[PDB]
Design a protein around this ligand. Structure first.
Ligand code: CLA
Ligand code: CLA
Ligand code: CLA
Ligand code: CLA
Ligand code: CLA
Ligand code: CLA
Ligand code: CLA
Ligand SMILES: CCCCCCCCCCCCCCCC(=O)OC[C@H](COP(=O)(O)OC[C@@H](O)CO)OC(=O)CCCCCCCCCCCCCCC
Ligand SMILES: CC1=C[C@H](O)CC(C)(C)[C@H]1/C=C/C(C)=C/C=C/C(C)=C/C=C/C=C(C)/C=C/C=C(C)/C=C/C1=C(C)C[C@H](O)CC1(C)C
Ligand SMILES: CC1=C[C@H](O)CC(C)(C)[C@H]1/C=C/C(C)=C/C=C/C(C)=C/C=C/C=C(C)/C=C/C=C(C)/C=C/C1=C(C)C[C@H](O)CC1(C)C
Ligand SMILES: CC1=C(/C=C/C(C)=C/C=C/C(C)=C/C=C/C=C(C)/C=C/C=C(C)/C=C/C2=C(C)CCCC2(C)C)C(C)(C)CCC1
Ligand code: SF4
Lengths: 212, 39, 45, 202, 738
């Protein structure tokens, strides 16, 4: 009935279609347990949201870098930010791990106890750190514009769009990494090189992707 | 998948994983701290 | 090559084995080729 | 059943205690798949030589079939719109789609008419029989409306296909041994039938 | 009717039975109560006869098991090629084989083990290998690391295909029993297709790739400058430039004018003088002949057509007056009992490996092999050990047949029955001849020791005192040296330099010279005969008395593997056939250790060495020293262990460490061999009390090892210790003085 990633095969029994982006893609059966599938749903959402955020950073910085605005390419940006400003590397690393460990540990112990971070123990806040679903923590802070509580069918549509754009940005970020590992260039430089000669500048001309 | 993790919970598999972890931890210590005799 | 010594020995061996189904044709033709190669390479010594 | 002349000396259509890829359902279906690919292979390996012979295509093309870039040690034509690996990835994606949807209709009969494929679902409903889907595109014209006419057309497809499979094996052996194209072998066997045979080219 | 017979989907692919240890045995699936269970779980894991009585399921299990083994071996070969391509000095070695040491293992720089990466030459540092892969790769025409890498990927792909084939032919499409019982068809297909097409395709590879590349390598042209093999296949004009026969093509083949192929299909004999290996043209002709012979042999047995022999008819046709029914019933035995087949195949496979060792030392088939003394010693020793182990295995599985599969109500007055029926005569005669051999062979050594110690060397058995010349072996040697003149007219030289003749040297080292045979060789050969006869005595007694003896009339009901039948009737320890395999293992170790010592000392003394005359590695001391035990003790063991004992602080230090470790393991075995599990069980009782006192007693009850497991652990550590000792000794010695 519903579209499967591989037409003809039935979906597995643990993938029903309740999840956003549920195409029955589990050939290694990594999520047969419901708790492990719950944990993997939240890991998929976190990887997807970081990949969307990082991929928009890649694209905007590369658009600003090809046109002569002085922006670095993303494999040089951390070095030129640490060296341009007087920023020491390890202190910014440790402050990042402080803030990220605070937020991520709150998310961890809200997965472990599914309503517990809204007890008022953090500063005075209550029900603004209560979650709504697994990986969907919409209150007043995380959903300030308030789209998860009106037009619930449209909210399911946004869940589908969020998972699809997130998978697309994950394979896009893997693309940036492998693309730079082969070509040694920024990504929109590679896009301009593909627009110059499409028939002759591609992955079958590097000598790396197919070494024959 | 439950049965595969039950098999991974068996004694020689866990002994292999744990001795790989312990031996690798000792190997990394002896790499970054070469030849400790005292302290 | 047609009409030489080796040609006549091979044809004579194949007719001598086929004179003595598709399976019988294959078996006696393989035996005739073996016997003929033996006689040809043995009359060189 | 199409092409059932009883020629099975090694007994591979035995239904008793069969399994794996040796089954009548897999063997007849692979027989017609090899037959159709070999008909296309025979026509495609002849056609540049006879169209260069008739003077229809230029002499920059009309090369021998093994010099196309199939075997770049045996010669490769430069003048395609891309490198042959750029061609080959398009071939990978395209044949993966085609062959893989065909596999799914073999393993699950009729399964290619439900999930959305840009409106192309009534075309791939298939039949209750592999190797002969039909529908609006695989059988465009209603050819074989009579069941006896359908059997006769299946038998003609079998015989033309087996002849083309023998022809493609002949193109391979001929291309290795004499190093020339098959139409060149036609010209040399029709010029001197006695002095240009397999017995001469040893 | 021979046909494909297969059952569809017998066993579901599921991780369920992975999570239930001992599922295969009704006794072991109950779970563990004592520690004995674990050992039982691993000991009976692959004993498929104890799993099911159904021959079909057993046959399927062994088939997929064999596929697993082949996939493992393909992983191993893949590894060797990959390590030869990425972590070796193979190309550098190709440029200078006589002064670069073959190395294909490198160690990481941690805890000081980096010292093992020694100066092997070629601007490389690693462990010098003695497996001989470099010579095999040069002989095959490989020149670059890329080709080795491609071979590694190919072998990995083939390993994946073999594991898929195993899973497929056990879980998806598993053959029926009457498929496995088509033994006539199996012999036809393996003799034609495997050996025949194997050697045909290899001769194809040789004639088309090996010969030109190695002819250019012997010519002296730089390896990178040599044309790639596909250019040798593609442009036949180059093949005609090296050997003009190739200009005429395959026209002399079909017209039977085969004499024109004498450029690359030769009968030279001897060795390539600039290379020290057999002529690849001789090897090509050899593999072509072998191919044609086996393809002829593979059309012998009747399958789906009238022509062809029938195995049961040939067996039942050979009956005489002395043997009664003769070979009747043997076909039924060898088509229903896997253990009988395994015994035959193990015996011939071991013997074949020993023949491989002798023929590969005597007639070096690879280029720059004879002068890589470490490789020669390693290969000979290795394949001799493998051989011996497979022979002991043959005796083991023969006995297992005798206990589990033997059934005399289909086997009544037969060859096997008469053997069982005069076993006392057989064993008593073997007993006597073993004592005779022991007395006179070993007694000559003790006699010599006594005479030498008493200051009377003129009374010894030696070449200058009382001589015992090997007249028969010398006559066969002389005859085989004179063979090219009269009884083999088309041979240019003899098949091996050791028969007699000149001397082939490469890079200043002796590749092979004529081997002389004197009193010492007479004495060691009769020592070999003695030890082999004793080993045969133990194993054969084990198989003949496996079912019954005057001591234990109902031994068959006690099984193949059991400790004893109690201290009564005087004592019945080690009455089982398994225990006869256990003793045969020790005696096999004894025999083959004396064999490899013979080979090592003799090669270093009378064959190997440098050419200035020839200066041998030990100066030729064999002929005078190998007649006393003190001579072996001092001039072989004591003298040649200098290199191993002073290997510390260099790249050979690992051989010293494994020398000590192997001595340790050998001694460690004696605790298991000399003791018994009653003492150990009581000791474990005391220790268990101590654990109970501190609430750390395990729920799985600590048990001492079984009697038979004590013996098994004993013999395994004994063999590992001794063999590894001789390994470290040999390798350190021959790498340092080579
Ligand atoms: C762009 C695709 C996309 C879509 C359709 C969604 C959709 C959703 N998000 Mg998600 N989110 C995204 C990207 C997206 N998100 C990214 C990249 C992050 C990491 C910053 C998050 C982190 C996040 C959190 C913490 C939460 C949500 C929640 C939600 C749900 C309700 C909020 C809403 O409706 O906003 C609709 C989304 C859009 C209209 C997309 C706007 C795209 C902008 C304009 C792109 C341009 C800016 C960019 C910097 C360049 C809805 C399913 C909430 C929830 O699940 O509540 C129950 C919630 O708490 N999201
Ligand atoms: C049983 C007797 C024994 C003892 C007391 C030692 C002791 C030592 N060995 Mg030796 N060794 C032994 C047997 C022994 N070994 C055996 C049997 C072998 C052959 C396998 C070796 C082969 C060997 C090598 C090749 C090396 C050593 C080294 C060492 C030193 C390692 C220190 C270390 O690991 O960092 C500190 C370890 C840790 C920090 C890990 C512990 C983690 C906890 C949490 C720390 C808690 C601390 C409070 C240490 C003095 C190394 C050395 O350089 O010696 C001078 C070295 O390179 N050993
Ligand atoms: C027609 C009669 C005939 C004659 C005179 C010979 C003569 C010879 N044969 Mg041949 N041979 C023959 C038929 C004959 N063969 C047949 C019918 C077969 C079975 C196919 C063979 C199979 C055969 C083999 C396998 C070999 C010979 C070989 C030989 C040569 C040496 C024989 C020897 O060693 O003493 C000698 C020239 C040997 C040889 O040296 O070939 C050059 C050799 O290896 N023969
Ligand atoms: C089959 C025989 C074989 C043997 C004896 C070796 C031996 C070696 N290899 Mg080679 N290798 C082989 C085949 C082999 N290789 C093959 C087939 C390939 C191609 C894939 C390679 C590719 C290769 C590379 C690229 C390298 C080596 C290296 C080495 C050396 C160090 C290995 C190491 O420390 O790994 C690391 C140790 C581990 C990964 C231990 C983890 C073991 C896990 C935890 C066990 C878990 C149990 C589990 C249930 C079973 C395993 C399942 C499996 C699918 C993971 C060692 C000499 C290294 C070397 O030579 O350095 C100079 C090196 O860089 N090998
Ligand atoms: C002429 C065809 C042929 C060939 C080449 C072989 C070869 C082999 N068989 Mg035999 N087998 C055959 C026909 C053949 N078989 C027939 C007709 C029967 C039924 C009567 C059997 C019944 C049989 C049994 C019961 C067993 C074998 C086993 C073996 C292997 C022995 C191990 C070895 O030393 O090889 C050296 C190794 C190699 C040369 C590796 C290369 C192997 C590849 C796959 C080429 C072999 C061709 C293969 C048969 C084609 C398979 C096509 C498949 C996709 C359908 C060897 C690979 C034993 C085995 O080990 O099974 C795993 C075994 O137990 N065979
Ligand atoms: C058994 C292994 C083996 C193999 C594979 C070869 C192979 C070859 N030999 Mg060799 N040869 C061998 C053993 C072998 N030989 C032995 C044992 C001897 C000693 C007697 C020789 C002595 C010898 C000589 C003297 C010569 C050769 C030559 C050749 C080459 C051409 C032969 C030919 O014309 O065949 C006939 C053609 C075929 C069999 C064609 C194969 C069938 C094709 C591939 C079928 C393709 C069909 C398919 C449908 C088409 C592709 C479609 C696809 C693209 C989609 C060929 C590479 C010649 C050469 O070139 O030397 C460099 C040559 O002069 N051989
Ligand atoms: C070096 C120690 C040693 C010695 C001398 C022996 C000796 C023997 N073993 Mg034993 N064996 C050994 C180690 C040894 N084994 C070990 C470690 C094991 C455990 C694995 C075994 C397990 C074993 C098995 C399973 C078997 C033997 C058998 C034999 C006998 C072989 C028959 C023979 O050749 O008689 C000749 C006698 C000798 C070679 C001994 C030395 C004789 C001297 C040199 C001459 C005698 C004259 C003497 C000096 C006169 C003394 C006079 C004085 C008293 C006044 C022989 C007595 C086999 C057997 O009995 O079957 C026939 C047999 O089947 N042994
Ligand atoms: C000599 C053996 C002749 C053997 C021989 O000629 O056997 C031939 C003899 C005749 O057998 P048939 O003609 O009845 O055989 C018919 C079928 O059973 C076999 O085709 O068989 C026996 O009688 C077995 C008796 C063995 C008697 C014991 C002989 C033990 C000899 C041990 C010494 C060997 C030393 C050298 C080893 C390399
Ligand atoms: C599902 C399943 C199921 C079955 O069972 C099995 C299998 C099949 C296995 C599976 C699959 C899987 C997969 C495919 C995965 C993938 C993933 C990924 C790719 C991720 C990424 C992911 C990715 C990510 C996160 C990313 C992120 C990124 C980022 C942040 C970036 C950043 C940056 C920037 C801005 C710029 C600067 O200057 C620098 C940097 C810093 C660089
Ligand atoms: C009947 C029977 C029965 C019994 O039971 C058993 C037995 C005997 C086994 C059986 C037999 C069988 C047989 C004979 C078979 C054969 C086959 C073949 C030949 C195939 C081919 C087959 C073939 C094929 C497909 C082919 C295809 C081809 C192709 C596509 C081609 C293409 C092409 C072209 C166009 C052109 C360009 O240039 C490119 C290329 C690329 C080159
Ligand atoms: C009667 C008749 C007829 C006729 C027919 C015919 C004419 C047939 C022929 C047939 C034939 C004509 C056959 C043949 C065959 C042959 C074969 C089948 C061969 C084979 C070969 C082989 C197998 C070889 C082998 C070898 C080699 C490879 C090398 C080494 C040596 C040898 C020699 C062993 C007709 C129809 C007209 C009419 C009706 C009646
Ligand atoms: S227990 Fe050990 S010793 Fe006592 S009889 Fe059985 S085997 Fe011999």
């Amino acid at each position: 009935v519903r579209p499967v990633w591989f037409p003809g095969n039935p979906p597995p029994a643990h993938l029903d279609g309740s999840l956003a982006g549920d195409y029955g893609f589990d050939p290694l059966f990594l999520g047969q347990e419901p708790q492990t599938l719950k944990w993997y749903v939240q890991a998929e959402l976190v990887h997807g949201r970081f990949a969307m955020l990082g991929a928009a950073g890649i694209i905007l910085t590369s658009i600003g870098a090809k046109v002569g605005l002085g922006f670095p390419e993303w494999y040089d940006a951390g070095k030129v930010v640490v060296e341009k400003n007087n920023i020491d590397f390890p202190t910014l690393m440790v402050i990042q791990f402080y803030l990220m460990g605070w937020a991520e540990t709150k998310r961890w112990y809200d997965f472990k106890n599914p309503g517990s971070q809204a007890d008022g123990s953090f500063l005075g806040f209550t029900e603004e750190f209560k979650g709504l679903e697994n990986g969907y923590p919409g209150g007043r802070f995380f959903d300030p514009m308030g789209l998860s509580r009106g037009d619930a069918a449209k909210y399911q549509e946004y869940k589908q769009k969020e998972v699809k754009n997130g998978r697309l940005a994950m394979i896009a970020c893997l693309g940036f990494a492998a693309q730079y590992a082969a070509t040694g260039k920024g990504p929109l430089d590679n896009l301009a090189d593909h627009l110059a000669d499409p028939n002759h500048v591609n992955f079958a001309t590097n000598g790396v992707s197919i070494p024959i | 998948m439950k049965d595969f993790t039950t098999y991974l919970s068996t004694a020689p598999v866990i002994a292999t994983i744990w001795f790989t972890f312990t031996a690798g931890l000792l190997i990394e210590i002896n790499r970054y701290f070469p030849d400790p005799l005292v302290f | 090559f047609i009409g030489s010594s080796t040609n006549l020995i091979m044809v004579a061996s194949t007719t001598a084995t086929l004179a003595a189904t598709i399976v019988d044709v294959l078996a006696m033709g393989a035996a005739g080729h073996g016997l003929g190669v033996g006689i040809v390479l043995g009359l060189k010594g | 059943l199409p092409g059932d002349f009883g020629f099975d000396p090694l007994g591979l259509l035995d239904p008793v205690n069969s399994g794996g890829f040796i089954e009548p359902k897999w063997l007849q279906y692979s027989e017609v798949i090899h037959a159709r690919w070999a008909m296309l292979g025979a026509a495609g390996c002849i056609a540049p030589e006879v169209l260069g012979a008739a003077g229809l295509i230029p002499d920059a093309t009309n090369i021998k079939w093994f010099e196309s870039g199939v075997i770049p040690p045996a010669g490769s034509y430069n003048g395609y719109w891309a490198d042959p690996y750029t061609i080959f990835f398009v071939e990978i994606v395209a044949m993966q789609f085609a062959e893989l949807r065909r596999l799914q209709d073999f393993r699950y009969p009729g399964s290619m008419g439900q999930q959305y494929f840009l409106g192309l679902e009534a075309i791939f409903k298939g039949s209750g029989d592999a190797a002969y889907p039909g529908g609006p595109f695989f059988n465009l014209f209603n050819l074989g409306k009579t069941e006896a006419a359908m059997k006769e057309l299946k038998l003609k497809e079998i015989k033309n296909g087996r002849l083309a499979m023998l022809a493609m094996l002949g193109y391979g052996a001929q291309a290795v041994m004499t190093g020339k194209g098959p139409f060149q072998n036609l010209v040399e066997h029709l010029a001197d039938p006695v002095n240009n045979n397999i017995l001469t080219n040893f | 009717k021979v046909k494909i017979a297969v059952d569809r989907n017998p066993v579901e692919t599921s991780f369920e039975k992975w999570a239930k240890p001992g599922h295969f045995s009704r006794t072991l699936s109950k779970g563990p109560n004592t520690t004995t269970w674990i050992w039982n779980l691993h000991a009976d894991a692959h004993d498929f006869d104890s799993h099911t009585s159904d021959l079909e399921e057993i046959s399927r299990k062994v088939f997929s098991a064999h596929f697993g083994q082949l996939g493992i071996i393909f992983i191993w070969l893949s590894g060797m090629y990959f390590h030869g391509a990425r972590f070796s000095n193979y190309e550098a070695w190709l440029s200078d084989p006589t002064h670069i040491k073959p190395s294909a293992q490198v160690v990481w720089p941690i805890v000081g083990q980096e010292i093992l990466n020694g100066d092997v030459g070629g601007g490389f540092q690693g462990i010098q290998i003695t497996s001989g892969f470099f010579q095999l790769w040069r002989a095959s025409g490989i020149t670059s690391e890329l080709q080795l890498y491609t071979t590694a990927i190919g072998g990995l792909v083939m390993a994946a295909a073999m594991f898929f084939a195993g899973w497929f032919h056990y879980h998806k499409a598993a053959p029926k029993l009457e498929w496995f019982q088509n033994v006539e068809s199996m012999l036809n297909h393996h003799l034609g297709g495997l050996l025949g097409l194997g050697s045909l395709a290899w001769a194809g590879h040789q004639i088309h790739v090996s010969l030109p590349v190695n002819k250019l390598l012997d010519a002296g042209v730089d390896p990178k400058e040599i044309p790639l093999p596909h250019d040798l296949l593609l442009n036949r004009a180059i093949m005609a430039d090296l050997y003009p026969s190739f200009a005429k093509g395959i026209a002399p083949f079909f017209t039977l004018n085969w004499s024109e192929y004498s450029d690359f299909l030769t009968f030279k004999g001897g060795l390539n003088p600039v290379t020290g290996g057999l002529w690849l043209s001789d090897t090509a002709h050899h593999h072509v002949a072998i191919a044609v012979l086996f393809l002829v042999a593979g059309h012998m047995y009747r399958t789906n057509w009238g022509i062809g022999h029938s195995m049961k008819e040939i067996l039942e046709a050979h009956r005489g007056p002395f043997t009664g029914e003769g070979h009747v019933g043997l076909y039924e035995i060898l088509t229903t009992s896997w253990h009988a087949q395994l015994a035959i195949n193990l015996a011939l496979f071991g013997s074949l490996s020993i023949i491989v060792a002798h023929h590969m030392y005597a007639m070096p088939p690879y280029p720059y092999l004879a002068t890589d003394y470490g490789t020669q010693l390693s290969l000979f020793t290795h394949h001799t050990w493998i051989g011996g182990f497979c022979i002991v295995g043959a005796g083991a599985h023969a006995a297992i047949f005798m206990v589990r599969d033997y059934d005399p109500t289909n086997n009544y007055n037969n060859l096997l029955d008469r053997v069982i029926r005069h076993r006392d005569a057989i064993i008593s005669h073997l007993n006597w001849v073993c004592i005779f051999l022991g007395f006179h062979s070993f007694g000559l050594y003790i006699h010599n020791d006594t005479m030498s110690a008493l200051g009377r060397p003129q009374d010894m058995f030696s070449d200058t005192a009382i001589q015992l010349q090997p007249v028969f072996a010398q006559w066969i040697q002389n005859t085989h040296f004179l063979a090219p003149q009269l009884t083999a007219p088309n041979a240019l030289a003899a098949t091996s330099l050791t028969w007699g003749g000149d001397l082939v040297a490469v890079g200043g080292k002796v590749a092979m010279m004529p081997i002389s045979l004197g009193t010492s060789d007479f004495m060691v050969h009769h020592i070999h005969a003695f030890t082999i006869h004793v080993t045969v005595l133990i194993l054969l007694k084990g198989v003949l008395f496996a079912r019954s003896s005057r001591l234990i009339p109902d031994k068959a009901n006690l099984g193949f593997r059991f400790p004893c039948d109690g201290p009564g009737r005087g004592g019945t320890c080690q009455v089982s056939a398994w225990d006869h395999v256990f003793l045969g293992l020790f005696w096999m170790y004894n025999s083959l250790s004396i064999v490899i010592f013979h080979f090592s000392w003799k090669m270093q003394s009378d064959v190997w060495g440098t050419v200035t005359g020839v200066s041998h590695i030990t100066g030729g001391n064999f002929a005078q020293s190998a007649n006393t035990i003190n001579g072996w003790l001092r001039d072989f063991l004591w003298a040649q262990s200098s290199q191993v004992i002073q290997s510390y602080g260099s790249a050979l230090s690992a051989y010293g460490l494994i020398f000590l470790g192997a001595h340790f393991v050998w001694a460690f075995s004696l605790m298991f061999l000399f003791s018994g599990r009653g003492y150990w069980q009581e000791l474990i009782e005391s220790i268990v009390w101590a654990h109970n006192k501190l609430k750390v007693a395990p729920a799985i009850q600590p048990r001492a090892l079984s009697i038979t497991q004590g013996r098994a652990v004993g013999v395994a550590h004994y063999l590992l210790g001794g063999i590894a000792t001789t390994w470290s000794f040999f390798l350190a010695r021959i790498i340092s003085v080579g």
